[PDB]
Design an enzyme around this catalytic site. Structure first.
Site, PDB file in Angstrom:
ATOM      1  N   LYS A  28       0.922  -1.158   0.109  1.00 29.16           N
ATOM      2  CA  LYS A  28      -0.089   0.063   0.060  1.00 29.16           C
ATOM      3  C   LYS A  28       0.729   1.326   0.147  1.00 29.16           C
ATOM      4  O   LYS A  28       0.939   2.066   0.965  1.00 29.16           O
ATOM      5  CB  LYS A  28      -1.124  -0.069   1.177  1.00 29.16           C
ATOM      6  CG  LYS A  28      -2.220   0.751   0.914  1.00 29.16           C
ATOM      7  CD  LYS A  28      -3.701   0.827   1.805  1.00 29.16           C
ATOM      8  CE  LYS A  28      -4.862   1.863   1.406  1.00 29.16           C
ATOM      9  NZ  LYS A  28      -5.963   1.216   0.474  1.00 29.16           N
TER      10      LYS A  28
HETATM   11  C1  LIG Z   1      -7.225   1.329  -0.002  1.00 27.23           C
HETATM   12  C2  LIG Z   1      -7.423   0.570  -1.304  1.00 27.23           C
HETATM   13  C3  LIG Z   1      -8.438  -0.842  -1.432  1.00 27.23           C
HETATM   14  C4  LIG Z   1      -9.412  -1.331  -0.432  1.00 27.23           C
HETATM   15  O1  LIG Z   1      -8.746  -1.558   0.463  1.00 27.23           O
HETATM   16  P1  LIG Z   1      -9.273  -1.721   2.093  1.00 27.23           P
HETATM   17  O2  LIG Z   1      -8.287  -2.740   2.828  1.00 27.23           O
HETATM   18  O3  LIG Z   1     -10.780  -2.385   1.503  1.00 27.23           O
HETATM   19  O4  LIG Z   1      -9.500  -0.382   2.326  1.00 27.23           O
HETATM   20  C5  LIG Z   1      -8.339  -1.656  -2.695  1.00 27.23           C
HETATM   21  N1  LIG Z   1      -7.555  -0.986  -3.812  1.00 27.23           N
HETATM   22  C6  LIG Z   1      -6.753  -0.029  -3.781  1.00 27.23           C
HETATM   23  C7  LIG Z   1      -5.759   0.313  -4.933  1.00 27.23           C
HETATM   24  C8  LIG Z   1      -6.651   0.682  -2.574  1.00 27.23           C
HETATM   25  O5  LIG Z   1      -5.818   1.815  -2.709  1.00 27.23           O
HETATM   26 CL   LIG Z   2      -9.225   3.595   1.966  1.00 28.53          CL
END
Ligand SMILES: *Cc1c(COP(=O)(O)O)cnc(C)c1O
Ligand SMILES: [Cl-]
Ligand SMILES: *Cc1c(COP(=O)(O)O)cnc(C)c1O
Ligand SMILES: *Cc1c(COP(=O)(O)O)cnc(C)c1O
Ligand SMILES: *Cc1c(COP(=O)(O)O)cnc(C)c1O
Ligand SMILES: *Cc1c(COP(=O)(O)O)cnc(C)c1O
Ligand SMILES: *Cc1c(COP(=O)(O)O)cnc(C)c1O
Ligand SMILES: [Cl-]
Ligand SMILES: [Cl-]
Ligand SMILES: [Cl-]
Lengths: 307, 307, 306, 306, 307, 307
Positions: free
Chosen positions: F156
């Site tokens: 992330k």
């Molecule tokens: C934040 C996000 C998600 C969803 O993740 P959660 O764990 O459900 O918040 C999915 N795909 C992307 C590209 C994201 O940035």
């Molecule tokens: Cl999010």
């Protein structure tokens, strides 16, 4: 001479000879065209024709038309009724092959359609079944690659897709084969030039999954139901590799027109258990009893025409 | 209404006589290849000039060869037939001429095998915009151009336009006039019915033929004109998407499209306008050539003898 | 039957003494790299000329380097060993000479550790067809050519030929004389054992080296001869499959294959025949060069002193 | 030094009599396919058990078929030949047995025509490490695994190991014990000489066969043992590179490598150690199986009658 | 302590300590950020600082900002003047490295920017040159693939791109190398983690072409001019393969910050002619005489600061 | 205006004290990884629930690990810090909490080497739309999603959002609310800030994790809810573009986006509406869970003790 008495065109059953047109009318439209292949199977004892999975075909046609972005014009129920009406009107009591074909009429250009309306004909003609015959074909893998979702979605039953099929089938013919199988751009097994492909290995049925880049064949769907429900076979829809198919105990093509077509060899590797091998034979026989209306368990797949 | 004549299978025929059945040509269309050719009407001379007729006839023959249509029509016949037809039609104005060849065999798409070769030529009025200053807003499509793996872009096949249609239909619904393609590798290929040129810092840049594009005759013309008349440096090479965003000018070229300036690409505006200085020069030189007012390039013109 | 000698690990040895154990070289073969070199016998002169010997010795050195074989045999030694062997064999005729280098290491395929470098040179009679007019029918294979991602084609490794074999085996069973490869991107690469040239509108066209091909010395020769003797334009570039279907002429080239005209590709016939006009000129010029009858290129030849 | 015998072309032969010429098998090696099979010596019983002999003989038959070698040696003959050889050698200890089949044809690499099929079986002492706790540090290679487009990994061909060698040579010079491959699409395939498993959250995960890997018999064994003895969930699927960095445990498996724990991948340490809890259980279960001390899987074993 | 007296921010030269902000201010903006690296070279004899190809850097920054779709706010001439002003104001008389960095301020989200305004600072700090030193690095090819136009155009000098650079440089460091080279998705040679790469083989200079998936390096451009014009070398911009680089006589990185960095080996294959080899040495020396203002032929590339 | 506090490097600090220099964090942002976490305010209970806090803290730790940030913060510390901060801020309403970790080392982008690990947690008010019925129109982007070759989507990382931004910026200029990605192979990946689900014939279908997507915690939640509460069949698999055009319903899910219905994709309308029947059920069940009104899923909630 050898033409049906009728066709259906733009909401109406018409005498064959009334659908005269100009040479230049439909060339641009053909690029937009999508179609379905549907069989009517004649059960002589009952004096009835059964159309196979008519509603599923009508629905897929509606989906193809939608994916081409043709404005709404013909409903699923109209397509089904039109088909019944046409087969009845033609009054030919025998195995038929029915082709609905939809097309957009717009720009006299190939590049871009513009403002368009939607048109459709249904064309039904005698076509023999070979479900009572044991035969098989020799297949090769093509050096041409199957179309994919990046360039020409194989889900859409578009006429244009068959230019790709033609590269492969023309190469099979000049190279001494009956029929060609495709690899997708990633090098995995896709489908035949006009049908889907199944392999049998160690009592298991294996077929490329839909996202391998193949038409979502209704015969394929039927076969998976029959294999699981009647024969209790394990059926895997999965990514399939080229060399594993060389080692299949059995293999076959399936499609509306081709029915169940056994494959004796692939790139000259001979299927170990013959063609039709034991399992193919069972599937072919079950399929035949279903489509001719002799198997009550699958009655809902059949549309009786009333003749 | 309609032209007085067509040419079909070796003969000029009255328009009204070329009637056929609705169901005749759908399978054939999968094999079909065509050319676009312009006749340009020079009112002062009272003469029509066909632009690079022999080059188009040759490319048609190559397309047919690549489809493996049996020999039937020579290049010389195609050229003479075209001249004859334009003369017979007796229309004194800009025309667009479409020779279209197709194989007839099996009423099947998947495979044709031992078939014969047929061809018509269809000439119709078509305006030029070479005296108008206009431009289009282009997007890059989310659909990928066909490539040699699946459907060789070299072959001017009707089926290829199904791919064009995905992109041009997306441009239309997304508020653009026209779409550009990327190839499977992500490099710039061509427009949906034309090739594309970029001008950056005095230099003309265009995707090379192995980018996966039709070998455009207008493209070829443009490269000759740019080098020989204007002394511009012209690069045929791999072209990246983001470099085109920064082009000073850009244009489409094709027989039908002529020289079409592009005002913006994905809403990035070409900073020298549309037609920018260099596009303007090329557009004007092209116009003087095709209308027969530039003796340096007279060899590219076939006078029809409308006088 | 057999040559009187071969060369092995720094020494000329009588043929019959180069006996080894069945199990000695199977793992080694996975590391092996080789060259093909022709000696051409000019009967009038009673001399053998080895063609571009030093260039082949250098490419062998490069292949060995790319396999990471420790230094053991210099370019000079390879060249001298070749000369000595052809002389010692005393066969006065066209020969094909194969140096083959291999690492001796782990009795495992997966990995070698510390290794030593070994090499033999094997010279045998081999006819030329440079006085014969013939041609082959080619297909494009459904098998893809190796690329730098998996098995660099630049390295003249034995293992690469397993890929060649997929294609040539398919050509044979499908009715063709020879197969051409597409690379993973779908562009024209090379033949199974040679490079490929196309002639279109008086121009020579050949896949560029980064198409994923061996840097053929016959290819290099041909480019020089086309430009210098015939004044032809030669383009090394990306080449597409369907453009080759429309070539006026086409040919394979390689040390063993010499200049091999192609009559058709996927049954599309080269319009100007096989050998067409330009191929014929190149084949004849090449023949006069390699047999030592064209003094303009004598520096490509090593006289053996036979 | 050397075993007393090998098996060759239908016959047991004394080691010293299997002498050949240096130049005999280089072209053949490009066609060659092989198997690795272990014989495990149970000292208490004074018996050797060959592990999944028939499955290996069948895979060898498949490889030979995929190379298009004419039928010559049946599965039954391969199995009997193996038994006979291990017995004749009279070595009472863990062995590693290599059948190797090759086509004899053209003295050319590019293409063989009509060919005959030959085969030897070579059995040698080879230690097991199934009683030792050890682990390796792995890297992902910058070289890509062969795929079905170019060189099907399903075929156990010698030539495939040239690709293995690119990766294992890079691992060695970059400070690692062993290399893992990505396929052309960038997904996890296999090791240079074995398949790979990951343990995450009590689950076993391994690249599916269409990831471009050999259909490992040790892999198959492990999947059975994990499911049947330990009741573990096992997923055969597409596996991503970064998910393996987060595996609790990881191991290689193959006939020669047995069960080899991996301590780290690209220096990301498996959190539960090496062998971690689950690997340890699988390694121990596998050991009890192959040495004939687990009667539930005795049908996988061929007693040699030593 | 060790901070410059000034920076430039949003049209104004300000004392360093006035650009205080909140920890949470710029994280979302950083995803949009683009930057330039620019050297000022101090010629002690002249008592002058020369900024190298300042206008070209300012222009590329404007292009990057455009490709990010930042609204217009700062002109090329303002960027150039701001740079001059800042270097003068800082009153450090020595080699400097100057980083303009532009960012959009909009949504407090990473996914999507929305309504945005454009901001920019220029940050100038002492930075040594090594153009008087002979040194070299050992490179490896990364197992991580270079970003491409499909996913993250390398033409755009975006901060985000360096996450990809970091995968490679971090792997080089843990694997015993000084520096990493990238392959593109097609497996061809692209560039270093923060510079472009050149190879010398048989007297010829070879560098990946721009559409190999690389930043259009200004040092790269300079080197190609110098090689052709001063040394009369043949320079090929082309597709480059991995194994051919293993056999290069010489190799080097070039970039604003890295200047000309010789490479002694690649994947432990040692460049045959050393590092800096003869040709690299000549290029490095010519470059140094240019950037320090001692070569009149290339004066137009230099912006004198006036101190 | 602003929250009363942040958490930074092991301590809660007054908002106003977390001042920094403009130039401090730009290089660090290239290394940065973050989490999005919601606190949901249940007014009846007067309590805030943090949703799947430990799962988010663990994924943060994994992201940091994959960046190779040295250990500094435990999962337990992250969880406690979050609770402490939300309590200290004393805001009684829906919040969105962003822990954001970064490495500080070299003031260079290309390489960091021996650096230290830092982290702040930033909690701010953020409305829920779980009580509103709304939907968005989606397009497929012409930009490709990052993949494991170039920038692993599992991590992330802030840098990944540069890729998100290409697509969401294209959606905005092309008249759409939101963009969906295809992966390099042309298969459906995820939204620009969320994962995507399709409903077809009673079945929930979502790209599998190896499609190249973040392992969304909302996605995971949804799969549990669909299977366990509603008994829906849920397939994680490769998903094709054109199949999604024919979905009965579709929705995005993510921490910030919650459950976002999609009305159409490339202007193909989901035929069961938005929120369709199944989306509606899932949205409502999710809402009752996160606000602490569904005891079956209480284990996913961390009460803050705002009482
Ligand atoms: C934040 C996000 C998600 C969803 O993740 P959660 O764990 O459900 O918040 C999915 N795909 C992307 C590209 C994201 O940035
Ligand atoms: Cl999010
Ligand atoms: C018509 C067709 C099939 C089979 O579909 P059915 O619905 O079973 O007739 C399979 N593949 C292709 C390419 C086809 O055109
Ligand atoms: C017709 C066409 C062109 C232009 O070809 P001309 O020979 O210039 O008419 C280019 N690209 C495509 C896809 C076309 O259909
Ligand atoms: C041997 C060979 C060639 C020819 O190279 P020369 O140096 O001309 O003999 C070309 N391609 C391949 C694959 C080869 O094996
Ligand atoms: C030998 C080998 C294996 C292991 O297969 P087993 O049948 O378990 O010995 C796996 N992968 C590769 C590449 C191999 O060479
Ligand atoms: C900054 C940089 C270069 C070199 O560009 P210059 O304009 O010569 O400083 C090359 N590649 C990358 C990835 C860079 O970031
Ligand atoms: Cl059909
Ligand atoms: Cl046109
Ligand atoms: Cl820099």
């Amino acid at each position: 001479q050898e033409n049906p008495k009728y066709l259906w065109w733009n909401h109406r059953i018409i005498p064959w000879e009334e659908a005269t047109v100009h040479l230049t009318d439909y060339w641009w439209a053909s690029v937009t065209a999508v179609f379905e292949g549907i069989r009517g199977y004649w059960n002589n004892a009952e004096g009835e024709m059964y159309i196979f999975r008519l509603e599923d075909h009508a629905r897929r046609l509606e989906q193809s038309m939608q994916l081409i972005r043709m404005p709404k014009e013909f409903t699923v129920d109209e397509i089904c009724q039109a088909t019944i009406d046409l087969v009845r009107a033609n009054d030919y009591r025998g195995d038929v092959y029915i082709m609905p074909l939809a097309y957009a009429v717009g720009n006299k250009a190939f590049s871009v359609v513009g403002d368009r309306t939607t048109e459709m004909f249904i064309y039904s003609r005698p076509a023999v079944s070979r479900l009572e015959e044991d035969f098989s074909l020799h297949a090769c893998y093509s050096s041409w690659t199957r179309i994919n979702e990046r360039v020409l979605p194989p889900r859409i039953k578009a006429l244009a897709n068959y230019r790709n099929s033609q590269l492969a089938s023309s190469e099979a013919a000049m190279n001494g084969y009956d029929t060609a199988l495709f690899l997708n751009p990633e090098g995995k097994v896709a489908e035949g030039t006009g049908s889907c492909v199944f392999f049998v290995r160690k009592g298991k049925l294996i077929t490329p999954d839909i996202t391998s880049g193949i038409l979502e064949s209704i015969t394929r769907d039927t076969v998976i139901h029959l294999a699981r429900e009647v024969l209790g076979l394990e059926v895997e829809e999965r990514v399939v590799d080229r060399t594993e198919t060389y080692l299949a105990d059995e293999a076959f093509l399936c499609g509306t027109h081709a029915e169940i077509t056994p494959i004796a060899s692939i790139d000259r590797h001979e299927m170990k258990h013959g063609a039709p091998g034991p399992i193919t034979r069972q599937l072919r026989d079950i399929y035949r009893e279903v489509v001719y209306g002799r198997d009550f368990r699958y009655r809902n797949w059949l549309t009786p025409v009333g003749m």
